[PDB]
A paper describes a structure:
For structural analysis of [name]-bound ribosomes, we reconstituted idle 80S ribosomes from S.c. in vitro with a 10× molar excess of purified recombinant [name] under defined conditions and performed single-particle cryo-EM. After refinement, we obtained a structure at 3.4 Å average resolution and local resolution for [name] ranging from 3.2–4.5 Å (left), which allowed us to build an atomic model for [name] (middle). [name] is exclusively bound to the inactive 80S in the unratcheted/nonrotated conformation, as, for example, observed in 80S ribosomes stalled with an empty A site. In our structure, [name] comprises 2 α-helices connected by a short loop. The first [name] helix is located in the intersubunit space between small and large subunit. More specifically, it occupies the P-tRNA binding site and the mRNA channel in the P and E sites of the small subunit. From there, [name] bridges over towards the A site of the 60S subunit, whereby the second helix stretches below the central protuberance and extends towards the GAC and the stalk base. In this position, [name] would overlap with an accommodated A-site tRNA. In conclusion, [name] occupies mRNA and tRNA binding sites on the ribosome that need to be accessible for translation, thus corroborating [name]’s function as a ribosome hibernation factor. We observed that under near-physiological buffer conditions, reconstituted [name]–80S ribosomes were almost quantitatively split, even more efficiently than puromycin/high-salt–treated empty 80S ribosomes.
Ribosomes are universally conserved biological machines that translate genetic information from mRNA templates into polypeptides with the corresponding amino acid sequence. Hence, regulatory mechanisms have evolved that facilitate transition of the translation machinery between active and dormant states. In general, idle 80S ribosomes accumulate in eukaryotic cells after exposure to various stresses like amino acid shortage, osmotic stress, or glucose starvation. Our cryo-EM analysis of human hibernating 80S suggests that in eukaryotes, at least 2 clearly distinguishable populations of idle, translationally repressed 80S exist.
Numbering used by the authors:
A (entry chain SX): 2 to 97
B (entry chain SC): 34 to 250
C (entry chain Ln): 1 to 25
D (entry chain SR): 2 to 89, 96 to 122
E (entry chain SV): 1 to 87
F (entry chain Sa): 2 to 98
G (entry chain SA): 2 to 207
H (entry chain SW): 2 to 130
Write the structure that this text describes.
RNA sequence: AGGGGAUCGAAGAUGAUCAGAUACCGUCGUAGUCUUAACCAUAAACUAUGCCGACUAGGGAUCGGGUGGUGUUUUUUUAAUGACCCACUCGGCACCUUACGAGAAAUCAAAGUCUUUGGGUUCUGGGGGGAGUAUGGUCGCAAGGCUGAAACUUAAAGGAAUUG
């Protein structure tokens, strides 16, 4: 039983099932598709440099309530205009 | 100033029975807890967990506490109690009493050739309590216990030194994790072994031997 | 909404999409 | 309703259990009996107890109660149980065919008959 | 379960069932020990003498305790021709 | 879950069975379903039997009957109280009271 | 091993056959096929009285050898077994539980009915199935006057008698009492019969 | 259809011993079944098996004695080398001292201790304890 | 496409209720409902339970077949026959009790013989939405079928049972 094959010669079938279900996996699909290059805001790199275009105070989500004080920046190497939250208190007073 | 209430209690108070070895041996029912109060001095406890359960009533919200507490001396006997009570203190107290009622023997073994007072389990063992399968693998000397903190403290109370502990299912529920480990430690003597293959003369029930110290007053 | 009526909605939407895509040569 | 409670009912069953021959069938006599032979803190509650006692006494004289028994009832039941008639020949044993085959294969004498 | 110097360990030895020879647990509160009488000549079952049997909870619950008792009693001579080996 | 092991009403090996129509609401309910009852009445109920016998020719001839087989949807069955919602443990009972 | 004085004794065989104990029920319950001897036509099954008496003497040898012979407990919930158990109890120790059982009477050490026996005897296992279960919980043998279509679960030694006649039930109780007394008891000379009549262990109308 | 007569024999035996039977009628038989039972018998896990010889394939009646916890088959019959015998033992036997892995070597059907001694290996068959 | 078109009846028309009522209720009625010749190819197409094989637990019914009975009723004198009864048997659709086991539980003699994991084999699933969507393919007269993503967003969604 157990639904899979168990014959001594079914390595091909086992291998191919594994290869077909790794796509139903999540993180493996992203790795092989290569979203970190073809689509992601960064080029898959760990950091990225930008030019501060504008400063957006955006309201948080419920049930909280606050302004979050981020900056709408544009990446230098790609050209995707993203939004970067700013860390601890006043750092928006620091970023022009 | 405890007084015995049952036949077995009469015997253990009259000191004619002095070993839970013999109690388990004859699979006698431990109805009082004072008997092992006598029969396992130095028996230390450990309150594994306290958690609130709630019932949703007409107007209010009836909260009571379920306390899970393990007990053991340190050498080959453990018991586990669960209790539900309106207050945490009474909960722990009655949990200790129920644990002492449910003390159970564990069979320690070797991971290889026998040398100096078995350290580990006798065989791989498994216990399942509602979707939590705790499995215990023997281990060589000096490997210690490798398990979750709760099962590790429980097996440490049991006295097994070296155990490999697989696990499966939603272990996050400590009640069921400890219940599973308890069924595993029971299945320890559950298993039959080429050592135990031999024959015995089937001992003769201290109830039946001392029946006269066992009648009423 | 009910899965059956949602299916019928997406059916009519698919029909309209096909129609405009066919009008677009 | 006039549905008397466990206090009076248990008290009445017990007093009839331990004072059956002294108790009587009259309400006033039973009442005074309770007065002298009970420590009860109300004339009203005593009257309720005594009334249920007379009622139970009537149904006890008419028949047995499922609830309570006395020394007298215990004695008469002892003897009624001890009665024994002559045990269960009419000649040979009764109708038996395959059980007769049983007794032949088992090896008895057993004067019996056919069926 | 002895140790290096041939010395015994394993704090106690369990009693094994007499129907299937399976270990009778400590928590098997269904496990039962029948003690029949050794009868000397002319009735008068001498007190203090037991032909001991140990029946397990599994056998008793599955309901073959009477079968196993009949077989064991005949095997130890307690009965004469109540249990047949070939059903 | 599965409120009933017989899946509501008994098929167990057909696959399809022709449906009948309820008698109150006329709803096409399968025939294995459709609470079925037998109405065996007299035409001339004892509210009027003696009247008829008093006023009738053919002395003591007979009294005929009306036989009807009623099929009921489950909705109208419960509504007209031919059947009632039972306890979870007495659902398994099949015998007719 | 049991000496040749302990055979069926055609007199007791007459008693059994006259009380009509050899009759069973129409359903066999294969766990009792050994005890069945033959199938009577017109749908009746004939219990083997030989095995009946042998199992009775075995059960008597079990009911003896209890050092404090009162700690035997004898249960009966039928009507046809109540006077039987009362008289059996009166003779041996055998604390009787007649009528209803008040369950939790072997566990629950604080009840007033809390017996803690080392053996039980049940007249009808199907209707005393609560006492059977309690004995299961607290580790106790069973000696039961079972019928053929009687549940053999959690029952130790069984005596197939009738469970459908007054005479069968009472007379099996009577013979068991006699045999347990004769095992040591005080009834010397097994070859001499017993004075007490089975009418004692019969239930009047009343 | 019947694919692994040995697997079915061992499964019948396991079921009978779990039920608490004393003997079991296996069908059909085979040389590998006879040899497997012989290994078991040598180590003490079963009693006596009587091979009823009808003309077709034979049947076996195996009088047990308890003391056999679980017998099973490993299918397919993987090729175990002498270095991987240990991995198999450690993966499907309870403790390092009892219980036997049963290989099918070119020296006959044997246990894993006999296998380590004669220093041969081959197709794994099953296991007993 | 052709025939036939009684009944019921999508659409539609109208009457009432309603705050409204493009609906429920009421009268009418088109396609349809039926058949022949061709298409489609999906359904809660359900036993939400793949097919083959082996073993494990009792019980009573019942359908088809088969064996046995110095059994019951039947012709006209009792054989044959038929049907019924009893015991068993093979294959079925199911059913009653237990939990021996399994399960998260509801519950299951198969959803058992699974941590003491391996009888053979096919297909499918990998948190919820977007989504059975877009697109490309292929089949179809068409409706549509099969195949089938992503960008993005989210900490839940869900199953079984308990107390309200
Ligand atoms: Zn209806």
């Amino acid at each position: 039983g157990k639904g899979k094959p168990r014959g001594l010669n079914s390595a091909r079938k086992l291998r191919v099932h594994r290869r077909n279900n790794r796509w139903a996996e999540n993180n493996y699909k992203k790795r092989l598709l290569g979203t970190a290059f073809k689509s992601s805001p960064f080029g898959g790199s760990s950091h990225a440099k930008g030019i501060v275009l504008e400063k957006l105070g955006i309201e948080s989500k419920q049930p909280n309530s606050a302004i979050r004080k981020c900056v709408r920046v544009q990446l230098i190497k790609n050209g995707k205009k993203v939004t970067a939250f700013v860390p601890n208190d006043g750092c928006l007073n620091f970023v022009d | 100033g405890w007084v015995p209430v049952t036949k077995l209690g009469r015997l253990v108070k009259a000191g004619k029975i002095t070993t839970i070895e013999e109690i388990f041996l004859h699979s006698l029912p431990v109805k009082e807890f004072q008997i092992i109060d006598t029969l396992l001095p130095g028996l230390q406890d450990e309150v594994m967990n306290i958690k609130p359960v709630q019932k949703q009533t007409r107007a209010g919200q009836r909260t009571r506490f379920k306390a899970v507490v393990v007990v053991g001396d340190s050498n080959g006997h453990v018991g586990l109690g669960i209790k539900t009570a309106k207050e945490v203190a009474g909960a722990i107290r009655a949990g200790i009493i129920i644990a002492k009622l449910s003390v159970i023997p564990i069979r320690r073994g070797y991971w290889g050739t026998n040398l100096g007072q078995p350290h580990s389990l006798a065989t791989k063992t498994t216990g399942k309590c509602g979707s939590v399968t705790v499995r215990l693998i023997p281990a060589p000397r000096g490997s210690g216990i490798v398990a979750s903190p709760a099962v590790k403290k429980l097996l440490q109370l049991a006295g097994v030194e070296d155990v490999y502990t697989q696990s499966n299912g939603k272990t996050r529920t400590l009640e069921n994790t400890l219940k599973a480990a308890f069924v595993a430690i029971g299945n320890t003597y559950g298993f039959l072994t080429p050592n135990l293959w031999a024959e015995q003369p089937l001992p003769v029930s201290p109830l039946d031997i001392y029946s006269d110290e066992a009648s009423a007053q | 909404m009910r899965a059956k009526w949602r299916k019928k909605r997406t059916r009519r939407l698919k029909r309209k999409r096909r129609k405009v895509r066919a009008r677009s040569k | 309703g006039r549905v008397r409670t466990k206090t009076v009912k248990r008290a009445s069953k017990a007093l009839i259990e331990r004072y059956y021959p002294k108790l009587t069938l009259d309400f006033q006599t039973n009442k005074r009996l309770c007065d002298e032979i009970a420590t009860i803190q109300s004339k009203r509650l005593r009257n309720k107890i005594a009334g249920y006692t007379t009622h139970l006494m009537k149904r006890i004289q008419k028949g047995p109660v499922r609830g309570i028994s006395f020394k007298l009832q215990e004695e008469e039941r002892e003897r009624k149980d001890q009665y024994v008639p002559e045990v269960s020949s009419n000649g040979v044993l009764n109708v038996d065919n395959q059980t007769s085959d049983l007794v032949k294969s088992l090896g008895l004498k057993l004067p019996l008959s056919v069926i | 379960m002895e140790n290096d110097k041939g010395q015994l360990v394993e704090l106690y030895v369990p009693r094994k069932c007499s129907a299937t020879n399976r270990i009778i647990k400590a928590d098997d509160h269904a496990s039962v020990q029948i003690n029949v009488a050794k009868v000397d000549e002319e009735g008068r079952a001498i007190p203090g003498e037991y032909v001991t049997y140990a029946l397990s909870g599994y056998v008793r619950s599955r309901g073959e305790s009477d079968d196993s008792l009949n077989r064991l009693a005949q095997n130890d001579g307690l009965l004469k021709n109540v249990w047949s080996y070939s059903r | 879950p599965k409120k009933r092991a017989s899946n509501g009403r008994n098929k167990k090996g057909r696959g399809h069975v022709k449906p009948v129509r309820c008698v109150n609401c006329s709803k096409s309910i399968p025939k294995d379903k459709a609470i079925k009852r037998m109405a065996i009445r007299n035409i001339v109920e004892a509210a009027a039997v003696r009247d008829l016998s008093e006023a009738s020719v053919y002395p003591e001839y007979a009294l005929p009957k009306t036989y009807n087989k009623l099929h009921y949807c489950v909705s109208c069955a419960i509504h007209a109280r031919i059947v009632r919602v039972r306890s979870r443990e007495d659902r398994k009972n099949r015998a007719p009271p | 091993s049991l000496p040749a004085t302990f055979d069926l004794t055609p007199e007791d065989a007459q008693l059994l056959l006259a009380a009509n104990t050899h009759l069973g029920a129409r359903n066999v319950q294969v766990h009792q096929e050994p005890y069945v001897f033959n199938a009577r036509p017109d749908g009746v099954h004939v219990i083997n009285v030989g095995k009946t008496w042998e199992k009775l003497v075995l059960a008597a040898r079990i009911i003896a050898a209890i050092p404090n012979p009162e700690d035997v407990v004898a249960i009966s919930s039928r009507t046809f077994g109540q006077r039987a158990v009362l008289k059996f109890a009166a003779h041996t120790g055998a604390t009787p539980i007649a009528g209803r059982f008040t369950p939790g009477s072997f566990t629950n050490y604080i009840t007033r009915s809390f017996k803690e026996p080392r053996l039980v005897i049940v007249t009808d296992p199907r209707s005393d199935a609560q006492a059977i279960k309690e004995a299961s919980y607290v580790n106790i043998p069973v000696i039961a006057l079972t019928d053929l279509d009687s549940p053999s679960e959690f029952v130790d030694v069984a005596i197939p008698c009738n469970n459908r006649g007054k005479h069968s039930i009472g007379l099996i109780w009577y013979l068991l009492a006699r045999e347990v007394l004769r095992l040591r008891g005080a009834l010397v000379d097994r070859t001499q019969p017993w004075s007490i009549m089975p009418d004692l262990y019969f239930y009047r109308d009343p | 259809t019947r694919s692994s007569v040995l697997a079915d024999a061992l499964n019948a035996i396991n079921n009978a011993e779990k039920t608490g039977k004393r003997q079991v009628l296996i069908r059909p038989s085979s040389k590998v079944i006879i040899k497997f039972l012989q290994v078991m018998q040598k180590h003490g896990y079963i009693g006596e098996f009587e091979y009823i010889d009808d003309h077709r394939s034979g049947k076996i009646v195996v009088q047990l004695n308890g003391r056999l916890n679980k017998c099973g088959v490993i299918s397919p019959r993987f090729n175990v080398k002498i270095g991987d015998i240990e991995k198999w033992t450690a993966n499907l036997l309870p403790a390092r001292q009892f219980g036997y892995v049963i290989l099918t070597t070119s020296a006959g059907i044997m246990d894993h201790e006999e296998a380590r001694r004669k220093h041969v290996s081959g197709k794994i068959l099953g296991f007993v304890y």
